[PDB]
Amino acid sequence: GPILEKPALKNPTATLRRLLGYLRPHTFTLIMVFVFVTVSSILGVLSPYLIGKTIDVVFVPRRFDLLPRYMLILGTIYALTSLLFWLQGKIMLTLSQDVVFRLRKELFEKLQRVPVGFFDRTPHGDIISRVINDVDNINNVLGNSIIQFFSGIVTLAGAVIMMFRVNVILSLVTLSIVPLTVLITQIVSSQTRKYFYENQRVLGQLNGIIEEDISGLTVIKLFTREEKEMEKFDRVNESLRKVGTKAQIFSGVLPPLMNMVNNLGFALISGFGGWLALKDIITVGTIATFIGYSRQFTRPLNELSNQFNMIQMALASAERIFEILDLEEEKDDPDAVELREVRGEIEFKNVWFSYDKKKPVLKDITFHIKPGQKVALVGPTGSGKTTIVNLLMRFYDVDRGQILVDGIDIRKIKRSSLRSSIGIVLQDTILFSTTVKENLKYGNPGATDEEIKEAAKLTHSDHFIKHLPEGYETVLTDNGEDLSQGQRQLLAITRAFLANPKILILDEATSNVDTKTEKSIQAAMWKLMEGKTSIIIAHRLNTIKNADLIIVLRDGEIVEMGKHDELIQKRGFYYELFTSQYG
Amino acid sequence: GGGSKTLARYLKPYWIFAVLAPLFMVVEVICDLSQPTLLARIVDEGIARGDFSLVLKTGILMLIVALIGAVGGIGCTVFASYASQNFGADLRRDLFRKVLSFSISNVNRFHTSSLITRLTNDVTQLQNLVMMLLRIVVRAPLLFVGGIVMAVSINVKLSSVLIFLIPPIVLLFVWLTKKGNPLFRKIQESTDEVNRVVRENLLGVRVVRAFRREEYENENFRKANESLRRSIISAFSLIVFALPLFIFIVNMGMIAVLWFGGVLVRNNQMEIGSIMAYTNYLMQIMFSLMMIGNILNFIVRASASAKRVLEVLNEKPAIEEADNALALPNVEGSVSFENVEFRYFENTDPVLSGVNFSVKPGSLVAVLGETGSGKSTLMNLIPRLIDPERGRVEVDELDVRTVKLKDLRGHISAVPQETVLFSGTIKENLKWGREDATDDEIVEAAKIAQIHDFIISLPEGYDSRVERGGRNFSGGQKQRLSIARALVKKPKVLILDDCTSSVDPITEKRILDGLKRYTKGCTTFIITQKIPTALLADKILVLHEGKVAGFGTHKELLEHCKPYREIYESQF
C-alpha cells in the first residue's frame, strides 16, 4: 500500500536505457500501441463534447431530424474507443509477458553459473521472494502502469485544452477543485502512511507471538505458560485494536473525500454554468460537457501519482535484477585440462581457507591420499572436515596453498571433468520431484533401464524400490517425503554409483535410520567404495577401524594422522575422541 | 457434531457501530442521488424559465448536499472501522485462547501451519468482510437500486432501456467468472511449478552442479517458464477483453438514452434537463453494478475463512483435567506403563501395544529403539500431552488422568530433539521453569548443560537476545540451552531425546556425566538409538516395533533380547 521511502536508484537513467533495450526488438509494435492510447484517449474526451453539441444541435432547437447523424457519430466513436482498449491491451499483454519470460531465463541461467557462495550466504526463501517480486514489479509496470500513466496524461491535457477553448471562466471554476484535491489527497495520504506502518509494526509483533506460540505449543504446556502467554498476547492485541482503527480510518476516508470533491465540481458547474447560461454566455450543452469532465481532476490525478511511484519502484526492481545479471560466473581456465584416466591421488599443500575471510576455518592442512585408499576424517563440530568436501569439488576456492588431483592443481582442471571423476554422497541428501528411475539416472543421462536395475540390485536399494506403490516409476513427491530415510540414502548411494566416479567423497548419516537398512547402506558403501579412492567423513565404527588413513581434525588444524590402532596406541586426541564414545 | 459456535457473537457488542456505519452511508448515497435531480432543475426550471434565484439557490443547495454527503461517508468509515477492528480483536483473542487449550491430538487434526494462517490471514479477511458489509455492501446496492428508482421516477417509459442494458452485463459477469476461474487456477499451478524448479535448483544446487547436469535444469525451467507465459497470457486475454466490452455496453447504453430520450422530448414528454440527469443516473447504475460484481468475488473466498476459523472455535480440547483431580505437592518420580496401546492417527497401525514397564524413583533409564519403535511417544505420554487408547500411564502409581495437569507437568521436564526458544533474552528463556531462580542457579544449570561458556562469550552474555523461535542459535546450541532450561525447572522426572543432537562431539559425554551428578532425586529417561549412550544408564528399555522387547542391562539384553543384539551388531 503506502510506500515506505523512495527507492535509492543508483543512476536510474543508466538502468532505464538497459531496460529500454529489452523491449527494443518490438519497437514498431510499441509505437503502434502508443498512437492507439493517444487516439483512444483523445476520442474519450471528445465524447462529452459531442453530447453537449448534440444537446445544442438536436435537442434544444428541436431539430430531431439531425439526431440519427449525431447518434451514429457517437456510436462509432464509442465503438472505436472500446476497440482500441482491447487492442492496446491485447498487444501489451504478450509484449510485456515475453519481456519477463526472458528475464526469467536470464536470472535462472545466472543461478546455474553464479558461485555457490551466493546461495550459501543468503536464506533461499528470500532470494526467491525478492527476485520474483522485483520481476512482477517490472511486469505490472511494463504491461500496465506505463500506458495508464501516459493515457492519463493525454486524457488530462485533452480535457483541459478543450475546456478552455469552449469557455475560460467555467474552466477556471472547475479547475478550482484541483488545489482542493491535491491538498486533501496529500494531508490524508500522510496519515494513511503513518498509521499503516504503526499498524504493520504491531500486527507483525502480534503475528510473531502467534507463530512462535503455536509452533512451540508443547513447550508452553510443559512449562504451564498458558496464562503468561495469554497476557503477552493481550497487551499487543489490545494495542492493535486501537491502532488498526486509526489505520483503517485514514485509509478509508480518501474516497468519500474524492467523491465529495466530485460533487463540488458537479455543483459549481451547475450553478456558475447555469448562471452563465441565463446570461447567454454559454449554452446548456456546454454545461453538459463540463459535467462530463467534472471527475477528471480528482482520482485520475491520484492515479497519475501512484502510477508514477510504481514506475519509480519498477526501476529499482530493474536495477537489482541487472546487478544479479552482472554477477561474475564460474569459468574454467583457458588452459584448463580434461581429466586423464587416473585412479585419483589427492593432495593438500599448506592450504588455508575461511568463509568470511575474517574467521579462519582451515589452517595449514597438509596430507596425501594415494589411489584406492579409504580415508577417514574425524573431529568435533568445527574441525572443518565438512569444508574439505567443498574445496575438492571447488565450490569454494582456497585462500592460501594448493589442492591437486593426480598432481595437477585443481584450479587448472576443467570443472566439467573434475566433478565426474569425483563423486559425492552428503549427509543432507537431495532427491527431486521425479520418478525413482529419473533420480537414479541423474548421474548418467545415457543409462539404460537395465543398468539402473542392476546397479540398484548391487546396492540393496532395488528391493524397496519395486515394493513402492508405483514401483520404479514412483514420483517421489516433495523430494522423497514418503520414504524411509535409509531408503533415501540408499537411493543417493545408488545414483552416485551410476556416475562411475574415480574419487568418492562420502558422508552417511546415522540419525533416524532403522537397523535393517543400516546393514544394507554400509554394504552399499562398500560396493560403492571398491575400485575408487574414498575420502569418508566417517560416523561408523566399522569404517574408522577399516580405514587405511585417519585424519584427526580440531579447530581446522590436523592434530593427528595414522591408522586406527596406531592412533589409539598414541593415546592422543583421537583417544579422547574415540574412547569417550566407543569406550 | 460440528459445533454451534458462531462468529456473529464477536460483532454483537459493537452493534451501534454496526448500525451507524450503514446509516451514515445512506446519507452519502441519498446526497449522491440528489445531485443530478438538482442539475435538471437548474435547467428545466431555472435556465429555461429565466430566474436567477432558482439557479443560485439550487446551486448553493448542491454544495450543502455535497458537504453533507461527505460526512455520511467519513462517518460510515469511522464506524465501520471500529466495528470491524473490535470484531477482529475479539475474534483473534478467542482463537488464541482456543489454541492454548489444544492438545497434540487437536493440533494434529489441523496442521500447525494451517492453525497459524487461521489466526492471522483468516482473521484479517473476516475483519475486512465486516468492513465491507458495513460500507460498499451498503453503498453499491443502494446506488444501483436508487438510481433505477430515480430513472423510473424521471420517466417510466425510458427506463425500459435498463431492461436491455442490465441482463447483458450480468451475463457478461457470469460468463467471465465461469470461464475465468479455471484459467486463473491454471496460472497459480504454473506459478507454483516455476517456484518448484527455482527452489529445488537452489536447495540441491550442490547436486545438479556436481552431476554436470545444469543444462537439464535450464531445459526443466523453460517448460515451467513457457507454461507460466501461456496460463497468464490466456487468463488475462479474457480480462483485457472483459473491460472494454463493459465500457461499450455502458456507452451504447447512453446512445440508447439520447436516442430513445430524443423521441420523448420531440413528443413533449421529457425536458432536456431530465435527459441530462438520466445520463448521470445511467452511469451510477452501471458502475455500481460493477462494484456488486466485485463484492461477490470477495464474499466467496472470505466465506472459506469463516469456515476455518469456525472449526477452530468449535474444536474441543482432547485432554481434560477431571473435576476432582488430585493435587501433587510433590512427586517422587516413579513411572509405569500398564498395557499401554498408543497411536497418533486412527488410520495407521499402533505405535505402542501392550507396553508394560515400571521405573523406580531416581533411575537413569535409557529408552533404546530404532525410528518408529515408539520410543519417542514416552516424552508425550508421561506428561499428559496424549492419552493412550488402551491401558494406563502412571506417575507415582497414580493414573495421570487423575492428577491436576499443572502439578503433573510442573514436575516433568521434556527435552525434545527439535527445540523451540522464544523472543527475549537467554535468561528469560532459561527462567521459564522458575521466575524466582537466581543467576547462580541458572549458571549452575547452564554449566551442567555445557552452554555456560558459550553464553558468557556473547557481548551481552545471559541478557543476550533470543530472536523469534530461537532462530539465531545453532542446533546444538539450542539443544543445550533447552537442556539448561529444563534443569532450572528442577524436574522430578526428566525425559531427554536423541541422546544429544546425533553424534555430537565428545562434550556430549560431559552432559551425560553431568546429569548423572544431578539426577540424584530425578528419574531420567534418555531416549537414544545409540548403544554407547544407553551404556551410561542403569537399565535399558529396548523397544521394537511398538512392543517392549526387553528391559535390563547390556549383559542380560545381549543374551535374550534379540532386537538389542541386532542393534548392537549394527553399531559394532
Coordinates of C-alpha atoms in Angstrom, one line a residue, chain B residues 215-417:
Chain B
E215 CA 21.5 -27.6 -18.8
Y216 CA 18.9 -30.2 -17.9
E217 CA 17.7 -27.7 -15.3
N218 CA 17.6 -25.0 -18.0
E219 CA 15.5 -27.4 -20.0
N220 CA 13.3 -28.0 -17.0
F221 CA 12.9 -24.3 -16.1
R222 CA 12.0 -23.5 -19.7
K223 CA 9.0 -25.8 -19.6
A224 CA 7.8 -24.2 -16.3
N225 CA 8.6 -20.8 -17.8
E226 CA 6.7 -21.3 -21.1
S227 CA 3.8 -22.7 -19.1
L228 CA 3.6 -19.6 -16.9
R229 CA 3.7 -17.4 -20.0
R230 CA 0.7 -19.3 -21.5
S231 CA -1.5 -19.7 -18.5
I232 CA -1.1 -15.9 -17.8
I233 CA -1.5 -14.8 -21.4
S234 CA -4.7 -16.8 -21.7
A235 CA -6.3 -15.9 -18.4
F236 CA -5.8 -12.1 -19.0
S237 CA -6.7 -12.1 -22.7
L238 CA -10.2 -12.5 -21.3
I239 CA -9.8 -9.7 -18.8
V240 CA -8.4 -7.4 -21.4
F241 CA -11.5 -8.1 -23.5
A242 CA -13.8 -8.0 -20.5
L243 CA -13.3 -4.4 -19.5
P244 CA -13.5 -2.7 -23.0
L245 CA -16.7 -4.7 -23.7
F246 CA -18.2 -3.4 -20.5
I247 CA -17.4 0.2 -21.4
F248 CA -19.1 -0.2 -24.8
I249 CA -22.4 -1.6 -23.4
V250 CA -22.4 1.3 -21.0
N251 CA -21.6 3.7 -23.8
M252 CA -24.1 2.1 -26.3
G253 CA -26.5 2.4 -23.4
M254 CA -26.1 6.1 -23.3
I255 CA -26.7 6.1 -27.1
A256 CA -29.9 4.4 -26.1
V257 CA -30.7 7.2 -23.7
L258 CA -30.2 10.0 -26.1
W259 CA -31.9 8.3 -28.9
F260 CA -35.0 6.9 -27.0
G261 CA -35.0 10.1 -25.0
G262 CA -34.8 12.0 -28.3
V263 CA -38.2 10.9 -29.4
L264 CA -39.6 11.7 -25.9
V265 CA -38.6 15.3 -26.0
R266 CA -39.9 15.7 -29.5
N267 CA -43.2 14.3 -28.2
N268 CA -43.2 16.8 -25.4
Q269 CA -42.7 14.1 -22.7
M270 CA -39.2 14.8 -21.4
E271 CA -37.4 18.1 -20.8
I272 CA -33.7 18.3 -21.8
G273 CA -32.6 18.6 -18.1
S274 CA -34.3 15.3 -17.4
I275 CA -32.3 13.8 -20.3
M276 CA -29.2 15.2 -18.7
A277 CA -29.9 13.7 -15.3
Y278 CA -30.8 10.4 -16.9
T279 CA -27.3 10.1 -18.2
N280 CA -25.9 10.8 -14.8
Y281 CA -28.2 8.2 -13.3
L282 CA -27.5 5.7 -16.0
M283 CA -23.8 5.7 -15.1
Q284 CA -24.4 5.4 -11.4
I285 CA -26.5 2.3 -12.1
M286 CA -23.8 0.7 -14.3
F287 CA -20.7 1.4 -12.3
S288 CA -22.4 0.4 -9.1
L289 CA -23.5 -2.9 -10.8
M290 CA -19.8 -3.4 -11.4
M291 CA -18.9 -2.9 -7.8
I292 CA -21.5 -5.5 -6.9
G293 CA -19.7 -7.8 -9.3
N294 CA -16.6 -7.3 -7.2
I295 CA -18.2 -7.7 -3.8
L296 CA -19.5 -11.1 -4.8
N297 CA -16.0 -12.3 -5.6
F298 CA -14.6 -11.4 -2.2
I299 CA -17.5 -12.9 -0.3
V300 CA -16.9 -16.4 -1.6
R301 CA -13.2 -16.5 -0.5
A302 CA -13.9 -14.6 2.7
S303 CA -16.5 -17.3 3.4
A304 CA -13.9 -20.0 3.3
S305 CA -12.1 -18.1 6.1
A306 CA -15.3 -18.1 8.1
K307 CA -15.4 -21.9 7.9
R308 CA -11.7 -22.5 9.0
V309 CA -12.0 -20.0 11.9
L310 CA -15.2 -21.8 13.0
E311 CA -13.6 -25.3 13.0
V312 CA -11.0 -23.9 15.5
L313 CA -13.6 -22.3 17.7
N314 CA -15.8 -25.5 17.7
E315 CA -12.9 -27.8 18.5
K316 CA -13.0 -29.5 21.9
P317 CA -9.5 -29.9 23.7
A318 CA -8.6 -33.6 23.8
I319 CA -7.0 -33.5 27.3
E320 CA -9.3 -32.6 30.1
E321 CA -8.4 -32.4 33.8
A322 CA -11.1 -34.1 36.0
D323 CA -13.4 -32.2 38.3
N324 CA -11.8 -33.5 41.5
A325 CA -8.3 -34.0 40.2
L326 CA -5.6 -35.0 42.7
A327 CA -3.1 -32.3 43.7
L328 CA 0.6 -33.3 43.7
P329 CA 2.5 -31.1 46.1
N330 CA 5.5 -33.4 45.4
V331 CA 6.4 -36.2 43.1
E332 CA 9.0 -39.0 43.8
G333 CA 9.3 -39.9 40.2
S334 CA 8.3 -43.5 39.8
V335 CA 6.9 -44.1 36.4
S336 CA 5.0 -47.0 34.9
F337 CA 3.1 -48.1 31.8
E338 CA 0.3 -50.6 32.2
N339 CA -0.7 -52.3 28.9
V340 CA -0.4 -49.0 27.0
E341 CA -1.6 -49.1 23.5
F342 CA -1.0 -45.8 21.6
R343 CA -1.4 -44.3 18.2
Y344 CA -1.3 -40.7 16.9
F345 CA -3.6 -41.2 13.9
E346 CA -6.6 -43.6 13.9
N347 CA -5.7 -44.6 10.4
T348 CA -2.3 -46.1 10.9
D349 CA -1.0 -49.1 12.9
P350 CA -0.5 -48.9 16.7
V351 CA 2.7 -47.1 17.7
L352 CA 2.7 -49.0 21.0
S353 CA 0.8 -52.0 22.2
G354 CA 0.9 -53.9 25.5
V355 CA 3.8 -51.8 26.7
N356 CA 4.5 -52.8 30.3
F357 CA 7.3 -51.3 32.3
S358 CA 8.0 -49.7 35.7
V359 CA 10.7 -47.4 36.9
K360 CA 11.7 -46.8 40.5
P361 CA 12.3 -43.1 41.5
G362 CA 15.8 -41.9 40.7
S363 CA 16.6 -44.5 38.0
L364 CA 18.5 -43.4 34.9
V365 CA 16.9 -45.5 32.2
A366 CA 18.0 -45.5 28.6
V367 CA 15.0 -45.9 26.3
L368 CA 16.6 -47.6 23.3
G369 CA 15.0 -48.4 19.9
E370 CA 15.1 -47.5 16.3
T371 CA 12.9 -45.0 14.5
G372 CA 9.2 -45.9 14.6
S373 CA 9.7 -48.3 17.6
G374 CA 7.6 -45.9 19.6
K375 CA 10.4 -44.9 22.0
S376 CA 9.6 -41.2 21.2
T377 CA 6.0 -41.4 22.5
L378 CA 7.3 -41.6 26.0
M379 CA 8.1 -37.9 26.0
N380 CA 4.4 -37.3 25.2
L381 CA 2.6 -39.8 27.4
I382 CA 4.4 -39.3 30.8
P383 CA 3.4 -35.7 30.9
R384 CA -0.2 -35.8 29.8
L385 CA 0.1 -34.5 26.3
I386 CA -1.7 -37.5 24.9
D387 CA -3.9 -40.2 26.4
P388 CA -3.5 -43.9 25.5
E389 CA -6.3 -45.7 23.6
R390 CA -5.9 -48.7 26.0
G391 CA -4.1 -49.2 29.2
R392 CA -2.9 -46.5 31.6
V393 CA 0.1 -44.4 32.3
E394 CA 1.1 -43.8 35.9
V395 CA 3.4 -41.4 37.8
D396 CA 3.9 -42.3 41.4
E397 CA 1.4 -45.2 40.9
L398 CA -1.3 -42.7 40.0
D399 CA -3.1 -42.6 36.7
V400 CA -2.0 -39.4 35.1
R401 CA -5.6 -38.8 34.0
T402 CA -6.5 -38.3 37.7
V403 CA -4.0 -35.6 38.7
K404 CA -4.0 -31.9 38.1
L405 CA -2.2 -31.0 34.8
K406 CA -0.3 -28.0 36.2
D407 CA 1.0 -30.1 39.1
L408 CA 1.9 -33.0 36.9
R409 CA 3.7 -31.1 34.1
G410 CA 5.2 -28.8 36.7
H411 CA 7.4 -31.8 37.9
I412 CA 8.3 -33.2 34.5
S413 CA 10.8 -31.7 32.1
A414 CA 10.9 -32.9 28.5
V415 CA 13.7 -32.0 26.1
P416 CA 12.7 -32.9 22.6
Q417 CA 15.1 -33.3 19.7

